[PDB]
């Protein structure tokens, strides 16, 4: 029981051939306890670090970290080609640690990648 059917206004349109097989019936209770903890791990780590910076040092500290992260993530490679995130790792501190995201299920060999223009204009918020 999730409530939230925006159903006030469930007027949204989807591309049927591109949506694949979506089952909102089961998209409310993750498949594993660790599914979201791992999906959003760099997100949650950034939020934890920004929170400690905010609480100890002030607004300026998370703002400058987020501004550096935004800048480096923007001189990148178009989404249908893999990037190295060299500068972003140097900023985040992952230039000298290897996690399981780095060795498992390598992003550089995806086994599946979409169309160039569709992936670029999805990153641009155009759908």
């Amino acid at each position: 029981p999730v409530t939230e059917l925006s159903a006030s206004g469930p007027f949204e349109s989807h591309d049927l051939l591109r949506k694949g097989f979506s089952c909102v019936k089961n998209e409310l209770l993750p498949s594993h306890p660790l599914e979201l903890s791992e999906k959003n791990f760099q997100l949650n780590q950034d939020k934890m670090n920004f929170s400690t910076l905010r609480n100890i040092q002030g607004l300026f500290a998370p703002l400058k970290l987020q501004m550096e992260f935004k800048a480096v993530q923007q001189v990148q490679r178009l989404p249908f080609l893999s990037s190295s995130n060299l500068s972003l790792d140097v900023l985040r501190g992952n230039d000298e640690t290897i996690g399981f995201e780095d060795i498992l299920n390598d992003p550089s060999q995806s086994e599946v990648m979409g169309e160039p223009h569709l992936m670029v204009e999805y990153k641009l918020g155009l759908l």
Partner: protein, 241 residues
Amino acid sequence: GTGYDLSASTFSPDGRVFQVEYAMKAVENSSTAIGIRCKDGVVFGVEKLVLSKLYEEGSNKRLFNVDRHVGMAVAGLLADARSLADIAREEASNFRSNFGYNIPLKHLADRVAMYVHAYTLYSAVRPFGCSFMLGSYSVNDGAQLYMIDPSGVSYGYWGCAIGKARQAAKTEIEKLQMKEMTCRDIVKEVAKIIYIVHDEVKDKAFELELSWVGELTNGRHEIVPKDIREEAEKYAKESLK
């Protein structure tokens, strides 16, 4: 420094960021605020310029209450000054929420000054064209007076003046032995100094804006009461002639 001065991320051939220097001149665009730290408190005073007789008295205030114990006197762009007042209020409230006591004034000055500096760093935002002073009093800390300028440099002062006539006001403050005066005599002298450096012809028809935080308010920032402000203005006028 022409050619190297359209961005806050460009260095002049002699290591000068010129947008920040132009922002400090922007502070020099406005009328003067002085702040004097005394033996038992801090007193602020602003040469507030009456834009019109149509404005309700108290509008366009330049003496904010940033926390229960901190008061802020500003110069430069007033919109920027109000945004920085909001930031300083947020910092003080956040500190109190996390740690359960009133934020030290030095720490508050550091937080806000580091915000101002963060704006002096990018091409996406421009430096703040506003300078301000913070002043507090605590029984366990004494009086404290800080000035932050648009470059993000905050120092601690015994007497400060920001604005158009900061140099003349600074000359006039240096004659005061403020380290051994109470807030009352400092209020009278602050009014005197505001009246001295006012340029009666170029600028016209100002109104004093006096404020203190001290032990006479029990470490609480306040506007100087109407009668004491009247006495200070009368002293300031009679001393001018």
